Amino acid sequence: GSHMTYPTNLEIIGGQGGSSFSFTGENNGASLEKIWVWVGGWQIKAVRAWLSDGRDETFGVPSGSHQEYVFTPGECFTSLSLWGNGAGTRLGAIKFKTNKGGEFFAHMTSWGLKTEYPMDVGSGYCLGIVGRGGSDIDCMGFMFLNAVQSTVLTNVNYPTINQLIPKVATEEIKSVSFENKTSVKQEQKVETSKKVIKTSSWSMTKSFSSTFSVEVSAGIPEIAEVSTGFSISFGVESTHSLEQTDEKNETLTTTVEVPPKKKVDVHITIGRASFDLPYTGTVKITCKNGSVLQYETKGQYKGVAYTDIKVNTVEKDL
Amino acid sequence: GSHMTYPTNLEIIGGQGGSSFSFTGENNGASLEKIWVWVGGWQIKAVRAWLSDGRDETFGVPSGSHQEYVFTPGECFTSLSLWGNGAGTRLGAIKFKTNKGGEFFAHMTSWGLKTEYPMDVGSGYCLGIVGRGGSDIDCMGFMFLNAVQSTVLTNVNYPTINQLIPKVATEEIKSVSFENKTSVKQEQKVETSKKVIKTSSWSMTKSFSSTFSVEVSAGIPEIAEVSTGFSISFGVESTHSLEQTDEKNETLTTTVEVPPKKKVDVHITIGRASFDLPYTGTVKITCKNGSVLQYETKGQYKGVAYTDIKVNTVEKDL
Ligand SMILES: OC[C@H]1O[C@H](O[C@@H]2[C@H](O)[C@@H](O)O[C@H](CO)[C@H]2O)[C@@H](O)[C@@H](O)[C@@H]1O
Ligand SMILES: OC[C@H]1O[C@H](O[C@@H]2[C@H](O)[C@@H](O)O[C@H](CO)[C@H]2O)[C@@H](O)[C@@H](O)[C@@H]1O
Ligand SMILES: [Cl-]
Ligand SMILES: [Cl-]
């Protein structure tokens, strides 16, 4: 009596005729964005569906005018009910509600509805539709992602990182001139503080990101000034949110050596690097029931990073 | 033996005449927002200054046209030089540069400039001006906050929080119905997932918040549902950023009991509260040199909080 769970929830209602179809985003996380439904006297006549990745297909044969539902980003199902045509030979009706307060009811027009089949919408995130059609919709179900435990973007790579040439802007923090007219050496302490705002951003479709809290397990591009110039590095892997902002007061204390009969001008700066480059990674969705749905993705990473505070001293003779 | 440090850095240049003035934001963290300078042949004639809290004072007696510098929020000094008039009796010239690339030079017109006094602007955040004036500016200095280690908003209170009436909006997550037409009760597993976005923000003058990374040590208002209705509570003190946003996938697994010969409607929802209320607190600035600047502040807290996921079941016959 072993028990198998799945990342998706699908209950098909109707008869056994027609030819099989599967129109879902279980390959790439795409969701149902729009649905057109044509009804007949004793069946659902046809369905045309659009997924968030641009796929568009029609099942059954349209007749007359259609009812539409357009889903907006983050709009999930709150409930779903299907009816057969009462004769066990066709789908008869579709009823659903969404988390934005929308409702949709399309039903056959001649025969009355009999047994209602209320569905578990899982997470509410609808991956699409599965069933059988021919002239009509013989049977159909809506596929849902089951209730989600975590959604992690991981195995992140930046394919062009090693070709990228860092665009570093200089930010002036402070300058001071010191003067030593004595014939002995002198030392001057200089303290520096500077707010740095580090940012990380990994692009993702608004519908997926608005529905799920995506944690990122990734290194980020980092900037540092070395001898030859500015170096970009693929940083160590850690946890981030999809959009992240970290603020800090970066500080430094410097002791400047001011030699006899010379003035030393001290220039303190920091470099701000803007990153904008493609990433690849894997979305791993872990459902509450222990199952996993995963797929490969790619998008754009945007980031702001800072170098260390840099101190530059120049000796003058006056 | 002992060494004394101060939160502020002030170096006054000029003579001993005139009457003392102090025009700074060391009481409330106000910064110099605008300065007008009138020059004469052998002195700075007058200075009018505006602080970011709206204060406005003139020192010395204006004559002729003025030069202006207007500082924008986050604009700090990078360097400053002052000159006397050469005779040690008046301020002779002011020169400064800002971290937005600005420069300002105002000087007496007839007598030549002699010894330059280059100043340490500390953090670059200018709290105002201090000196002596009568007919002219006898002497003046610009006061800076010294290089900052940490800036913390602390001892936060919400003085209206106990009077506040909960205004919780319901978000629908999931509804489903089960039918038990047998003479024995049944059990149904229902799993729920739901993204919540919790926010917190404490208002702060842009000038101060643009320049320093402000950490917040405060409790936030939180919302729960109890027997009576909704309950606002002052949460436990912890660390936040000045603007904070945290995402989480709230989850819940429920066993629904379906009594014999009954229909059970299951309604899964969550409450979202939008807090918008005043706060008081203490800004504590800790300088790199170990000194501290502290003042009471007042502002507006905004925040989005959520209740726990709520399952309501309602049983019907048939
Ligand atoms: O989807 C319904 C049905 O369509 C196809 O059968 C057709 C219909 O029954 C009707 O239009 O009459 C046609 C011929 O008289 C018939 O082909 C099949 O795909 C069928 O399997 C399906 O159930
Ligand atoms: O700020 C300079 C100077 O102003 C005041 O002195 C005045 C001026 O020297 C001049 O205008 O003549 C006036 C008349 O005798 C004189 O008051 C004083 O406040 C002085 O202390 C100050 O140094
Ligand atoms: Cl049926
Ligand atoms: Cl002088």
Side-chain angles (χ1 to χ4, degrees):
Chain A
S2 59
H3 179 74
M4 187 149 257
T5 59
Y6 308 93
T8 65
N9 204 308
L10 172 67
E11 294 290 354
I12 296 161
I13 298 296
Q16 290 174 331
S19 287
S20 283
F21 67 86
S22 180
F23 192 65
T24 67
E26 61 199 303
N27 53 307
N28 63 352
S31 64
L32 179 67
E33 186 171 349
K34 188 164 62 183
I35 187 158
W36 284 7
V37 182
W38 291 268
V39 304
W42 57 287
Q43 71 277 81
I44 299 295
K45 194 72 193 64
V47 175
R48 181 172 181 189
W50 286 260
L51 301 183
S52 54
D53 63 7
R55 280 136 77 193
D56 165 18
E57 279 182 50
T58 301
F59 308 100
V61 176
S63 192
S65 47
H66 68 266
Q67 289 172 254
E68 173 176 84
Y69 201 87
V70 189
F71 300 84
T72 51
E75 187 172 23
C76 292
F77 281 63
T78 52
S79 60
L80 170 72
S81 272
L82 302 181
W83 293 254
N85 65 352
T89 56
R90 304 282 190 283
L91 181 70
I94 298 153
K95 173 73 186 318
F96 63 79
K97 285 174 161 63
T98 81
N99 66 356
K100 295 290 169 168
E103 65 168 51
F104 183 84
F105 188 31
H107 57 81
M108 64 187 175
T109 58
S110 285
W111 296 353
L113 302 185
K114 300 190 187 169
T115 310
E116 182 189 343
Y117 300 96
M119 303 311 184
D120 192 325
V121 304
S123 65
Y125 188 82
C126 181
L127 295 164
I129 55 179
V130 177
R132 309 184 98 93
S135 280
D136 301 339
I137 300 305
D138 293 84
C139 69
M140 202 178 81
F142 288 80
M143 179 180 281
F144 298 95
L145 192 70
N146 268 314
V148 168
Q149 181 67 36
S150 69
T151 53
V152 180
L153 176 64
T154 186
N155 308 334
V156 172
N157 194 41
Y158 310 93
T160 67
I161 193 169
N162 295 298
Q163 301 144 60
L164 196 68
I165 290 132
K167 183 171 191 161
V168 186
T170 301
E171 288 191 14
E172 302 296 336
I173 301 168
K174 53 147 57 150
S175 292
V176 60
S177 180
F178 293 117
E179 201 178 53
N180 181 11
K181 288 183 167 170
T182 323
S183 62
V184 303
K185 299 169 198 167
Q186 291 184 344
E187 285 189 348
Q188 297 285 16
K189 192 163 165 157
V190 187
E191 294 174 320
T192 302
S193 62
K194 167 64 175 181
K195 180 186 178 179
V196 302
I197 308 172
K198 300 157 280 173
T199 66
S200 280
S201 161
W202 291 267
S203 69
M204 199 145 271
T205 58
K206 187 162 141 61
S207 33
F208 190 83
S209 41
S210 294
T211 302
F212 305 107
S213 179
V214 184
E215 297 174 48
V216 186
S217 177
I220 60 172
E222 298 181 33
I223 195 73
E225 196 184 57
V226 297
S227 302
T228 56
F230 291 113
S231 172
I232 297 171
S233 65
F234 197 126
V236 68
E237 300 185 4
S238 68
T239 311
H240 309 264
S241 57
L242 261 182
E243 309 256 67
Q244 185 157 316
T245 299
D246 291 39
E247 295 192 344
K248 177 166 182 160
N249 294 319
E250 200 156 351
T251 68
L252 180 73
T253 173
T254 322
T255 312
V256 189
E257 186 168 30
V258 195
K261 307 170 203 176
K262 270 201 145 64
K263 82 172 188 178
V264 184
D265 292 6
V266 186
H267 309 283
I268 308 187
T269 59
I270 191 162
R272 183 185 194 265
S274 179
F275 296 107
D276 194 342
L277 75 174
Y279 77 87
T280 57
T282 77
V283 181
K284 286 189 198 177
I285 301 154
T286 305
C287 290
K288 292 193 61 43
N289 70 12
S291 60
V292 173
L293 187 73
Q294 79 164 55
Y295 59 84
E296 301 300 287
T297 186
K298 70 183 220 299
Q300 203 71 357
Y301 175 87
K302 287 180 182 169
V304 171
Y306 283 77
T307 67
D308 285 2
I309 293 160
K310 180 200 175 186
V311 178
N312 190 18
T313 59
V314 296
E315 269 175 31
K316 276 186 168 68
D317 192 53
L318 286 174
Chain B
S2 278
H3 180 72
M4 181 151 264
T5 57
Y6 308 91
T8 61
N9 205 315
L10 174 67
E11 214 69 69
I12 297 162
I13 299 297
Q16 299 285 302
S19 291
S20 291
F21 70 84
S22 185
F23 188 66
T24 78
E26 62 198 291
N27 51 305
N28 62 354
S31 62
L32 179 65
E33 183 169 3
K34 187 162 68 181
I35 189 164
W36 286 6
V37 187
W38 293 265
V39 302
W42 56 286
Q43 73 274 82
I44 301 298
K45 279 292 289 104
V47 173
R48 182 173 173 193
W50 286 260
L51 300 183
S52 58
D53 64 9
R55 285 143 80 193
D56 168 10
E57 290 179 44
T58 301
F59 308 99
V61 173
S63 186
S65 39
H66 65 268
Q67 291 170 254
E68 171 176 84
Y69 201 87
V70 187
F71 300 84
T72 52
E75 182 167 28
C76 289
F77 281 66
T78 55
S79 64
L80 164 71
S81 281
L82 298 182
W83 287 255
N85 63 347
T89 55
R90 304 283 192 281
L91 182 71
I94 296 160
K95 172 152 180 51
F96 66 77
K97 296 188 187 173
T98 75
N99 66 354
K100 313 311 292 210
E103 74 174 44
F104 184 81
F105 187 39
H107 57 87
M108 61 186 177
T109 57
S110 187
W111 290 11
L113 301 184
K114 301 304 189 190
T115 299
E116 180 189 338
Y117 304 95
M119 306 302 186
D120 191 327
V121 304
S123 69
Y125 189 80
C126 182
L127 297 163
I129 56 175
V130 181
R132 290 209 157 98
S135 280
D136 299 338
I137 305 297
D138 293 274
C139 67
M140 206 179 71
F142 284 78
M143 180 180 286
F144 300 95
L145 188 64
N146 270 307
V148 177
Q149 178 83 48
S150 77
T151 56
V152 180
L153 171 62
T154 196
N155 301 120
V156 175
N157 190 36
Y158 306 98
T160 73
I161 197 180
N162 293 338
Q163 298 145 248
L164 205 61
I165 306 300
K167 277 270 281 187
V168 183
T170 305
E171 292 191 14
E172 306 291 333
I173 304 170
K174 194 177 193 166
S175 280
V176 66
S177 201
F178 299 111
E179 277 210 28
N180 181 12
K181 304 219 299 294
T182 73
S183 63
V184 189
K185 63 191 163 71
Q186 294 169 195
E187 281 184 353
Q188 291 283 7
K189 196 176 198 284
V190 191
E191 290 170 329
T192 300
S193 68
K194 166 59 165 173
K195 188 183 176 192
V196 303
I197 301 163
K198 300 164 210 183
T199 62
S200 287
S201 76
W202 294 261
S203 67
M204 184 88 67
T205 51
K206 274 175 195 162
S207 185
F208 193 86
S209 45
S210 312
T211 301
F212 305 108
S213 172
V214 184
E215 210 152 284
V216 181
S217 172
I220 56 169
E222 278 164 19
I223 194 75
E225 181 141 48
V226 297
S227 193
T228 304
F230 298 114
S231 162
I232 297 164
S233 66
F234 199 142
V236 65
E237 199 182 343
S238 79
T239 301
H240 300 265
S241 64
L242 202 59
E243 300 283 332
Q244 189 155 334
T245 308
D246 288 315
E247 300 192 332
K248 204 203 176 195
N249 282 316
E250 281 297 319
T251 64
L252 183 74
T253 307
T254 308
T255 313
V256 180
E257 188 183 325
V258 194
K261 310 303 183 75
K262 300 277 188 192
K263 186 170 168 188
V264 175
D265 297 347
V266 185
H267 298 278
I268 308 185
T269 64
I270 193 169
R272 177 193 204 250
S274 286
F275 294 109
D276 187 359
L277 81 178
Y279 80 88
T280 56
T282 296
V283 176
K284 176 174 176 160
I285 305 165
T286 304
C287 288
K288 199 78 183 293
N289 69 23
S291 61
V292 295
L293 194 72
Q294 186 173 309
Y295 54 91
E296 301 301 316
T297 195
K298 205 170 80 78
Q300 199 71 358
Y301 176 82
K302 280 177 158 77
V304 176
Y306 283 76
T307 70
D308 277 6
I309 292 163
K310 177 143 152 275
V311 182
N312 187 235
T313 61
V314 295
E315 70 179 57
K316 303 170 168 179
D317 280 326
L318 308 167

PDB file of all heavy atoms in Angstrom, chain B residues 161-173:
ATOM      1  N   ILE B 161      -0.763  52.949  19.246  1.00  0.00           N
ATOM      2  CA  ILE B 161      -0.986  51.564  18.830  1.00  0.00           C
ATOM      3  C   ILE B 161      -2.104  50.861  19.606  1.00  0.00           C
ATOM      4  O   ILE B 161      -2.836  50.056  19.030  1.00  0.00           O
ATOM      5  CB  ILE B 161       0.318  50.734  18.901  1.00  0.00           C
ATOM      6  CG1 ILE B 161       0.179  49.444  18.086  1.00  0.00           C
ATOM      7  CG2 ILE B 161       0.712  50.447  20.345  1.00  0.00           C
ATOM      8  CD1 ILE B 161       1.407  48.560  18.099  1.00  0.00           C
ATOM      9  N   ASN B 162      -2.233  51.168  20.895  1.00  0.00           N
ATOM     10  CA  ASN B 162      -3.276  50.562  21.735  1.00  0.00           C
ATOM     11  C   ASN B 162      -4.684  51.109  21.496  1.00  0.00           C
ATOM     12  O   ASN B 162      -5.656  50.499  21.922  1.00  0.00           O
ATOM     13  CB  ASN B 162      -2.923  50.702  23.221  1.00  0.00           C
ATOM     14  CG  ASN B 162      -1.702  49.892  23.612  1.00  0.00           C
ATOM     15  OD1 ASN B 162      -1.336  48.929  22.937  1.00  0.00           O
ATOM     16  ND2 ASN B 162      -1.063  50.279  24.708  1.00  0.00           N
ATOM     17  N   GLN B 163      -4.795  52.245  20.821  1.00  0.00           N
ATOM     18  CA  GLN B 163      -6.099  52.827  20.499  1.00  0.00           C
ATOM     19  C   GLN B 163      -6.595  52.401  19.125  1.00  0.00           C
ATOM     20  O   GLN B 163      -7.756  52.613  18.783  1.00  0.00           O
ATOM     21  CB  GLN B 163      -5.998  54.344  20.526  1.00  0.00           C
ATOM     22  CG  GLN B 163      -5.615  54.886  21.889  1.00  0.00           C
ATOM     23  CD  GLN B 163      -4.741  56.113  21.792  1.00  0.00           C
ATOM     24  OE1 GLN B 163      -3.565  56.066  22.152  1.00  0.00           O
ATOM     25  NE2 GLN B 163      -5.305  57.216  21.291  1.00  0.00           N
ATOM     26  N   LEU B 164      -5.709  51.788  18.350  1.00  0.00           N
ATOM     27  CA  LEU B 164      -5.959  51.540  16.941  1.00  0.00           C
ATOM     28  C   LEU B 164      -6.978  50.409  16.747  1.00  0.00           C
ATOM     29  O   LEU B 164      -6.905  49.377  17.409  1.00  0.00           O
ATOM     30  CB  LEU B 164      -4.630  51.205  16.254  1.00  0.00           C
ATOM     31  CG  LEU B 164      -4.484  51.455  14.758  1.00  0.00           C
ATOM     32  CD1 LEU B 164      -4.673  52.924  14.414  1.00  0.00           C
ATOM     33  CD2 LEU B 164      -3.103  50.982  14.325  1.00  0.00           C
ATOM     34  N   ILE B 165      -7.944  50.629  15.860  1.00  0.00           N
ATOM     35  CA  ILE B 165      -8.926  49.605  15.524  1.00  0.00           C
ATOM     36  C   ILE B 165      -8.355  48.809  14.362  1.00  0.00           C
ATOM     37  O   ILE B 165      -7.994  49.393  13.342  1.00  0.00           O
ATOM     38  CB  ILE B 165     -10.289  50.206  15.100  1.00  0.00           C
ATOM     39  CG1 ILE B 165     -10.828  51.176  16.165  1.00  0.00           C
ATOM     40  CG2 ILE B 165     -11.305  49.103  14.817  1.00  0.00           C
ATOM     41  CD1 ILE B 165     -11.055  50.562  17.531  1.00  0.00           C
ATOM     42  N   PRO B 166      -8.262  47.478  14.514  1.00  0.00           N
ATOM     43  CA  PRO B 166      -7.825  46.623  13.411  1.00  0.00           C
ATOM     44  C   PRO B 166      -8.668  46.796  12.136  1.00  0.00           C
ATOM     45  O   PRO B 166      -9.897  46.749  12.192  1.00  0.00           O
ATOM     46  CB  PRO B 166      -7.988  45.203  13.973  1.00  0.00           C
ATOM     47  CG  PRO B 166      -7.927  45.352  15.458  1.00  0.00           C
ATOM     48  CD  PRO B 166      -8.459  46.721  15.768  1.00  0.00           C
ATOM     49  N   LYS B 167      -7.997  47.023  11.010  1.00  0.00           N
ATOM     50  CA  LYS B 167      -8.627  47.037   9.690  1.00  0.00           C
ATOM     51  C   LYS B 167      -7.944  45.972   8.837  1.00  0.00           C
ATOM     52  O   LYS B 167      -6.939  46.239   8.177  1.00  0.00           O
ATOM     53  CB  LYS B 167      -8.480  48.412   9.043  1.00  0.00           C
ATOM     54  CG  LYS B 167      -9.530  49.417   9.485  1.00  0.00           C
ATOM     55  CD  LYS B 167     -10.763  49.384   8.591  1.00  0.00           C
ATOM     56  CE  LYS B 167     -10.531  50.131   7.283  1.00  0.00           C
ATOM     57  NZ  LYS B 167     -11.771  50.251   6.469  1.00  0.00           N
ATOM     58  N   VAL B 168      -8.486  44.758   8.885  1.00  0.00           N
ATOM     59  CA  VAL B 168      -7.897  43.609   8.211  1.00  0.00           C
ATOM     60  C   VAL B 168      -8.691  43.272   6.953  1.00  0.00           C
ATOM     61  O   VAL B 168      -9.895  43.034   7.022  1.00  0.00           O
ATOM     62  CB  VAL B 168      -7.880  42.381   9.141  1.00  0.00           C
ATOM     63  CG1 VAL B 168      -7.192  41.202   8.475  1.00  0.00           C
ATOM     64  CG2 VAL B 168      -7.183  42.716  10.453  1.00  0.00           C
ATOM     65  N   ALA B 169      -8.016  43.261   5.807  1.00  0.00           N
ATOM     66  CA  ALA B 169      -8.623  42.816   4.560  1.00  0.00           C
ATOM     67  C   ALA B 169      -8.435  41.305   4.413  1.00  0.00           C
ATOM     68  O   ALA B 169      -7.348  40.770   4.656  1.00  0.00           O
ATOM     69  CB  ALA B 169      -8.002  43.542   3.379  1.00  0.00           C
ATOM     70  N   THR B 170      -9.494  40.615   4.015  1.00  0.00           N
ATOM     71  CA  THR B 170      -9.412  39.179   3.795  1.00  0.00           C
ATOM     72  C   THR B 170      -8.834  38.898   2.416  1.00  0.00           C
ATOM     73  O   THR B 170      -9.266  39.484   1.429  1.00  0.00           O
ATOM     74  CB  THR B 170     -10.791  38.516   3.879  1.00  0.00           C
ATOM     75  OG1 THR B 170     -11.391  38.843   5.133  1.00  0.00           O
ATOM     76  CG2 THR B 170     -10.667  37.002   3.764  1.00  0.00           C
ATOM     77  N   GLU B 171      -7.851  38.006   2.361  1.00  0.00           N
ATOM     78  CA  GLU B 171      -7.409  37.441   1.098  1.00  0.00           C
ATOM     79  C   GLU B 171      -7.835  35.978   1.035  1.00  0.00           C
ATOM     80  O   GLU B 171      -7.517  35.184   1.926  1.00  0.00           O
ATOM     81  CB  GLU B 171      -5.902  37.572   0.943  1.00  0.00           C
ATOM     82  CG  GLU B 171      -5.447  39.011   0.789  1.00  0.00           C
ATOM     83  CD  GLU B 171      -3.993  39.144   0.370  1.00  0.00           C
ATOM     84  OE1 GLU B 171      -3.386  38.143  -0.065  1.00  0.00           O
ATOM     85  OE2 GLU B 171      -3.459  40.267   0.464  1.00  0.00           O
ATOM     86  N   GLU B 172      -8.569  35.648  -0.023  1.00  0.00           N
ATOM     87  CA  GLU B 172      -9.050  34.291  -0.264  1.00  0.00           C
ATOM     88  C   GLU B 172      -7.877  33.475  -0.767  1.00  0.00           C
ATOM     89  O   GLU B 172      -7.170  33.907  -1.673  1.00  0.00           O
ATOM     90  CB  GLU B 172     -10.138  34.285  -1.345  1.00  0.00           C
ATOM     91  CG  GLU B 172     -11.314  35.221  -1.091  1.00  0.00           C
ATOM     92  CD  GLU B 172     -12.176  34.776   0.066  1.00  0.00           C
ATOM     93  OE1 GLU B 172     -12.216  33.560   0.342  1.00  0.00           O
ATOM     94  OE2 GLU B 172     -12.815  35.645   0.701  1.00  0.00           O
ATOM     95  N   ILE B 173      -7.661  32.305  -0.190  1.00  0.00           N
ATOM     96  CA  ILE B 173      -6.606  31.434  -0.679  1.00  0.00           C
ATOM     97  C   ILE B 173      -7.195  30.254  -1.443  1.00  0.00           C
ATOM     98  O   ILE B 173      -6.765  29.951  -2.553  1.00  0.00           O
ATOM     99  CB  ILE B 173      -5.695  30.941   0.454  1.00  0.00           C
ATOM    100  CG1 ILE B 173      -5.109  32.138   1.217  1.00  0.00           C
ATOM    101  CG2 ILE B 173      -4.569  30.098  -0.119  1.00  0.00           C
ATOM    102  CD1 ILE B 173      -4.380  31.783   2.493  1.00  0.00           C
TER     103      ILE B 173
END
